[PDB]
Amino acid sequence: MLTILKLGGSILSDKNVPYSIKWDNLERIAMEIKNALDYYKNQNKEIKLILVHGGGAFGHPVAKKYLKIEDGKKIFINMEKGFWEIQRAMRRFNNIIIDTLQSYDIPAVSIQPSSFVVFGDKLIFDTSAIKEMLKRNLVPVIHGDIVIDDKNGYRIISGDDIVPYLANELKADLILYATDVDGVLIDNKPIKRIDKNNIYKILNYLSGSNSIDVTGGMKYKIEMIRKNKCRGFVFNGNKANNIYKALLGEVEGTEIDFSE
Amino acid sequence: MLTILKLGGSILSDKNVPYSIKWDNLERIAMEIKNALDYYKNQNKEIKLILVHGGGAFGHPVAKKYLKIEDGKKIFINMEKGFWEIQRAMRRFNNIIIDTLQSYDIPAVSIQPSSFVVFGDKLIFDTSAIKEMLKRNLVPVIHGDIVIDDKNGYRIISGDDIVPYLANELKADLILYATDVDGVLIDNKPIKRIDKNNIYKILNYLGMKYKIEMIRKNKCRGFVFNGNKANNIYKALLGEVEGTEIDFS
Ligand SMILES: [Hg+2]
Ligand SMILES: [Hg+2]
Numbered sequence: 001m002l003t004i005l006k007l008g009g010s011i012l013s014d015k016n017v018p019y020s021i022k023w024d025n026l027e028r029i030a031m032e033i034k035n036a037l038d039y040y041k042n043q044n045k046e047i048k049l050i051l052v053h054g055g056g057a058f059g060h061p062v063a064k065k066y067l068k069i070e071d072g073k074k075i076f077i078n079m080e081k082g083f084w085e086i087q088r089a090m091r092r093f094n095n096i097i098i099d100t101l102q103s104y105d106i107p108a109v110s111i112q113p114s115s116f117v118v119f120g121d122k123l124i125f126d127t128s129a130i131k132e133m134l135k136r137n138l139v140p141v142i143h144g145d146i147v148i149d150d151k152n153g154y155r156i157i158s159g160d161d162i163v164p165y166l167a168n169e170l171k172a173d174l175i176l177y178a179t180d181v182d183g184v185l186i187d188n189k190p191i192k193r194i195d196k197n198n199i200y201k202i203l204n205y206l207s208g209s210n211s212i213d214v215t216g217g218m219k220y221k222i223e224m225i226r227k228n229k230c231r232g233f234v235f236n237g238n239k240a241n242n243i244y245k246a247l248l249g250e251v252e253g254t255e256i257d258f259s260e
Numbered sequence: 261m262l263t264i265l266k267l268g269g270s271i272l273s274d275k276n277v278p279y280s281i282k283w284d285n286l287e288r289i290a291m292e293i294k295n296a297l298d299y300y301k302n303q304n305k306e307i308k309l310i311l312v313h314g315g316g317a318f319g320h321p322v323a324k325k326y327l328k329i330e331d332g333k334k335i336f337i338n339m340e341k342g343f344w345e346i347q348r349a350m351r352r353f354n355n356i357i358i359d360t361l362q363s364y365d366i367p368a369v370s371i372q373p374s375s376f377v378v379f380g381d382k383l384i385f386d387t388s389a390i391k392e393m394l395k396r397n398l399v400p401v402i403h404g405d406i407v408i409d410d411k412n413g414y415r416i417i418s419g420d421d422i423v424p425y426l427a428n429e430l431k432a433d434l435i436l437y438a439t440d441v442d443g444v445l446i447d448n449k450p451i452k453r454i455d456k457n458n459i460y461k462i463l464n465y466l467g468m469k470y471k472i473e474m475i476r477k478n479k480c481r482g483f484v485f486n487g488n489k490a491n492n493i494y495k496a497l498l499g500e501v502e503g504t505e506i507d508f509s
Contacts, residue, residue, distance in 0.1 A: 080367035083398060084358060087370050091351065098344060107340035110347050114369070116376040116389045126386040129376045132408040138343060148392040 002048040002134070002172045003247065005033075006159050009180030011237040012097065013056025020057045021093075026100050029178075029243055034104040036247035048134040049247075050166060051101075051108065052159045054144045058093035062086050063146065063156055076146075076154040083154065086146040087114050094143045101141065109133060111142040113162070119147050119155040127169050134170075142166075160217070164224035167232075173259075175230050176246045177221055178237025183253030184222070185212040190235075194222060194256045222256055231259040262308040262394065262432045263497060265293070266423050268439035269404075271487040272357065273316030280317040286360050289438075289493055294364040296497035308394040309497075310426060311361075311368065314419040315404040318353040322346050323406070323416060336414040343414070346406040347374045354403045367398050373405040373417055380410035383421070387429050394430075402426070420471050428478040435480050436496050437471070438487025443504030444468045454506040472506060481507040 007029060014020040033051075040047040055063070066082030068075050076082060094110055101108040111130060118124035130140050144158040167175050183190025186205060194202050199222065205211060206219045218234065225232050235242050235253030246252045267289065274280040293311075300307040315323070326342030328335045336342065354370055361368040371390060378384035390400050402422055409415035427435050443450030446465055454462055454472065463469065468484070475482055485492050485503025496502045 079396065080365075080398065081362065083369045083393075084362055084367075088355070088359075091355070091370070095348065095351070099348075102341065102344055105340075107344075109343050109374070110351070110372070111375045112370070112372045113375075114389075115371045115373075116386050118388045118392055124386070124388045126376050126384070128378045128384045129374075129408050132378060132410055133343075136408070136413065137340065148389060148396065150392065152395070 001046055002050070002170055003174045003176060004050045004052060004163055004167055004172045005176040005178065005243070005247065006163050007051060007053045007178050007237060008159055009178070009237060010056070011178060011180060012053060013058065013093070015057050015060060018057055018061050021096060025238065026097065028240065029237065030101050030104045030106060032241065032244040033101065033247065034106050036244050037106065039248060049139050050130070050134070050170075050172075051139060051141045052143070052162050053093075053097060053141070054159045055090055055156075056093060058089040059086060059144055059156065062089040079154055083114070083146055083148075086156075087112070090114070090143055090145050094141065098141050101139070106139055107137060108139045108141045111140045113142065113145040113157050114147050117145075117147045117157060118150055119157060120150040123157075123161070123165055124150075125165060125169075127166065130166075131170065160220060164228055167224075167230050168228040172230060174249065175225060175232030176243075177232060177234040178243055178246070179234060180236065180238060181213075182236045183234050184218045184256075188212055190254045192251075192255065194254060196258065199226060225256045226258045229258045229260055231255070231257045261306070262310070262430055263434040263436060264310045264312065264423055264427055264430075264432045265436045265493070265497065266419050266438060267311065267313045268437070268487055269314035269316035269419075270440040271438060272313060273318070273353070275317055275320065278317050278321035281356060285488065286357065288490065289487065290360045290364045290366060292491060292494035293361070293497065294366055296494050297366065299498060308397070309399050310390065310394070310430070310432075311399060311401045312419045312422050312426075313353075313357055313401070313403050315350055315416070316353060318349040319346065319404060319416065322349040339414055343374070343406055346416075347372075350374070350403055350405045354401065357403075358401050361399070361401065368401045369393060369398050371400045371402040373402065373407050373422070377405075377407045377417060378410055379407055379415040379417060380412070383425055385425060385429075387426065390426070391430070420467065420474070424474040424478050424480060427475075427480045427482075432480070434499070435475065435482030436493075437482060437484040438493055438496070439484060440486065440488055441484075442486045443484050444472065444506070451504050454504065454508075456508070475506055476508055479509050481509065
């Protein structure tokens with residue numbers, strides 16, 4: 001039973017406030033994760049868990065200084081300074097999250113993409129260590145990070161890039177997207193379920209002018225779950241117990257199911 | 261083309277003092293490395309450089325808490341806490357070193373083994389990222405770290421493990437070992453060179469062993485010199501011989 005939980009939205013950090021940390025939320029989230037891990041142990045049910053988080057007010061604020069738009073394209077500059085500066089900011093955010101998780105006795109450990117991942121048409125991302133960590137009951141905590149590509153450039157790898165890749169690569173049984181909203185909003189209300197019988201209808205809706213989310217973020221999550229034939233929930237990570245419940249397999253928000 | 265400089269734990273920290281940093285040495289070292297890189301580009305000569313450092317006085321203090329004796333071997337315990345605590349200690353040391361290097365405009369970046377390296381039947385160490393970084397003229401800084409061991413569960417990979425592996429894996433032209441001694445000491449005296457000739461007698465007399473061993477198993481070529489002596493590191497990066505030379509072809 002492998003579950004990958006993405007702590008997204010702005011539940012851990014306010015992107016507006018530089019280097020801000022939502023301490024209270026982070027601690028509650030840690031509490032719920034611990035509560036869930038304890039539940040599984042008592043129910044004698046095995047559970048492998050991978051946590052993924054973005055840069056929050058740590059990554060983007062730093063990366064922006066090294067980002068430029070040239071010929072209508074994103075390009076990283078002055079990276080002889082920028083690669084490290086971004087790595088440094090992410091490392092700090094990851095330290096804080098892992099330290100907090102460990103304070104509730106969650107066996108979290110650090111996975112830093114910038115050290116070994118290469119952004120190509122097909123990511124070079126060795127999961128050997130991660131597999132071994134999960135075998136020994138550790139909880140790998142992977143974060144969005146700056147990474148080099150295979151074309152003389154760089155790229156910010158995000159949680160949205162990381163979750164699908166690992167979901168497929170490790171054959172996760174469940175994907176959990178903790179966000180700032182209640183689910184995939186159709187008429188300002190989370191649609192209970194998205195599957196092979198309504199996905200296109202939902203994606204076209206999301207592409208419409210009546211869509212609460214026009215960022216295409218939900219569309220991408222849905223598309224990747226279909227692609228890798230996974231099952232996942234998109235829910236509000238800000239609501240007490242949602243994370244605990246989602247980790248127990250209880251549908252929260254919107255269920256996206258394409259598992260075979 | 262590619263040189264791999266190893267900074268001995270002894271010259272960056274004090275093993276006798278947990279969480280110790282030899283600030284002046286570190287800064288001198290960074291400065292010398294900076295001057296060397298400037299020398300090459302001034303000659304318009306392209307030089308790829310990878311830096312490696314051990315856990316110094318950060319690993320042991322913490323790792324010791326998670327290392328026990330089953331009878332005569334090393335046993336890792338409570339790694340649900342220990343893996344992160346050791347990672348954290350190593351990350352702290354690495355940050356300090358890279359921040360110092362960056363303060364001298366050395367384009368250093370962090371390579372954390374714990375996140376992707378696996379010990380055991382054949383080292384699993386993906387170098388794709390490092391290769392790309394070297395093409396950007398970035399200076400990867402790799403460090404000793406706790407890593408998963410598919411056989412023994414856990415293992416503290418050291419600079420002596422990393423350097424040769426990368427030396428071979430990246431076809432490095434020069435291997436440099438900056439340490440606190442004038443070279444490999446035999447009867448308290450630094451030997452000028454170690455070849456296929458005196459190697460036999462040197463191996464019986466004999467960490468330099470485990471070190472001279474793998475540099476042998478990879479037909480590498482390197483110099484073991486004193487990193488505490490002003491300008492040795494600078495001179496060594498310019499291809500100059502310093503201390504004990506081990507040119508195994
Ligand atoms: Hg899947
Ligand atoms: Hg070699």
